[PDB]
């Protein structure tokens, strides 16, 4: 990571250009260059580079992943003062509190809603059951009822939860990670009903995010399911759309998982004070959030003063209504195993590869399984960096070269104890043990430098291949 | 601390002899000697020796202190499996959960009750107000209404809370340590009313724990206030006593602070596996708790199977009733500042040294103040130990001598990086930094050993005066 700059990662479906305009204001006032990138598989890529002490200074994702990140030590603790705390809704801070500490800044509260084409469906269905009969008549006109992203369980979860599916049972303000509601009767009814939509050719097993967005925005489908970030494309879309409450299933409301979009600071960032100023003084203001909201809407934001202005919009109202019927995601580390499990279950049952309940029988135990964790970045390890090698005195061409270094905190305590002697001899007076993070293996390297004009010098240096914790006086 | 033994600290008002009989069973089965001690100022002494990596393997205290202990790193995390977890009431585990982890074993739930002499008061007063008028008539007969320990705010708290005093405001399952209810109208009414009892010679400012126990157990006072641990002396007391609900004040019930007596394991203990077996397999069984309960009763215990048997006792019922009207103490670190503040306030207002509200004005800000914390035992520091110095070869008298050693974890990361050379010369190929916990100052020592029978040898060794974290290759 580079000192004197901010690299920020946020999902490609969110308003990164808006966020980059906030970045520009910050550059103007401080000189600090903000870079906003949006890799794919972001929620997976961050722990992978951050475990190596690399990655962005700031990471944005819904709060359900952040418990996991914090456990492995990827996230700094954040230090908003009380005055800043009060500018945001307390329940949004709760979503980012983990083992008693705030591990990210909440930005916006997200929930799925039903997005409907008012010209094909003046009156959108209040229940899921009436969808087959409504797809019936739309297809008679060259359209379809409903498309949504079938590849991410986030979009199907609301339906599975409806009849009593749940992730980990929540009671007494705590989740029991051995009490998983993924193959109960309710989850079965929910998932089977989706599988029926597909078998009865009302939906298409392969339908993904862009396919659903295309279909709805070209007005070939009457409904889709999505979050506030999609709205932006539908205005400029030739579509006259509404945003409403999700339909009910077996008489019960759809229970979307609610996510608080959040910004965490990489524990490895040499730019924490910058990230703090950026987030508190630039992003989380009326104008910062407006800039992002202009690009891709955030939904019900977490800053009160700005949510007060946005609240007079039916679309936000609907987002909230849907939020209220749904439940906030836990942020506990076990969530990454739950999501993996449900993603397999749904894709498998949708594509015919397993029966429902033959898929959710497996997701049931898969969701409570122990998982491999992100290694902790404080451990002794090897770092790659690029440096230009120069002569200390003579004027020469300098080369840019990849080098490696060792850094970390050896876990063993260091100790020192007296030795006794009678030997009038010299001696070390102390027996000690101290572990240092050091090269275990390395190889010799040589580089020709060109000097003006006498003469060609050869610089040697060792290239470190591996590090380990070894005794100091070895 | 000694490997292969267990030293346990518990308060002198609790059943330590009973606990020592549990200790004997453990010795019999394992060979491990259990020692139970009961220092005074225990809740203060533990952090003081434990910050130096010393102290007992196991510490017993109500759970309100344990948050504080855990923050400074004095307590190991405990690892009961689910099967063990279910043997105890979930709300008792909640009292020992801190920042998401279990930091002690819950033993018993404690609450103050009104203990009354059935022969002087067949009908105990349901309210505090009717106490002056009842002391009136008892003193006419050479007795007094009520004595209790006025030196510990635990005993007066129930009265101060009654009309709306509170420690830190509790909402959303979290305490705001800037919202303290110590000089509100309710706390003022509560404390003033106690001060009136004293001014009107119904109680005595200096009355302490043993003074109250003496008076009640010699039948000179009709009532006292106390917890289950006192009951034991009152049976064998010539007193025919009852245990009932605390009286109401300004129409509201008395709100005792509820404490879950708990056993934590010293982070510095080389005997954690032993402490675990002791507590889980010996203390926390029907028979372990019975042994303690026989000595000094525990109250409503935390093990379900044993609380089921005890529940048919009016005294336990009353303890619980009083528990229900009261509130469980927070376990947050700020509690030690709250207690200090209220102890000053009460002693001062009772002895006339300040006005009420001139005392609680000060406790108000004192209770939310930052406090000095227990230093963390993992830091580089000096340890004292005793060792016998011998000759390695020749048979000699061995002396027992006090020695010092350095031990700890230096916080700075260790690193290692390549150097570049052109000098065809030797060199260290790496620039590195590594901190080790080492003697900063020391002094030379010499000791005469007597050998059989040739000849007198002198052993020298350095006595370490201080340790610090220094660079490895210095
Ligand atoms: O599909 C499982 C997935 O659900 C959520 O991801 C959402 C995210 O919260 C939204 O901000 C938006 O980007 O869409 C995503 C759905 O593809 C969870 O946050 C995530 O952890 C989980 O894997
Ligand atoms: O007086 C303040 C004091 O109250 C509590 O101490 C109780 C303890 O909980 C009981 O087990 C029994 O030993 O009596 C003590 C009262 O003297 C808190 O536990 C303690 O932290 C606090 O200082």
UniProtKB/Swiss-Prot annotation, chains A, B:
One cellular component term from this protein's GO annotations in UniProt: outer membrane-bounded periplasmic space
Broad class of where this protein is predominantly found: periplasm
Gene3D superfamilies named among the record's database cross-references: Periplasmic binding protein-like II (3.40.190.10)
Parts forming coiled coils: none
Localisation per UniProt entry: Periplasm
SUPFAM superfamilies noted in UniProt: Periplasmic binding protein-like II
Subunit: The complex is composed of two ATP-binding proteins (MalK), two transmembrane proteins (MalG and MalF) and a solute-binding protein (MalE).
Function field: Part of the ABC transporter complex MalEFGK involved in maltose/maltodextrin import. Binds maltose and higher maltodextrins.
NCBIfam families associated with the record: PRK09474.1
UniProt-recorded name of the protein: Maltose/maltodextrin-binding periplasmic protein
Gene name of the record: malE
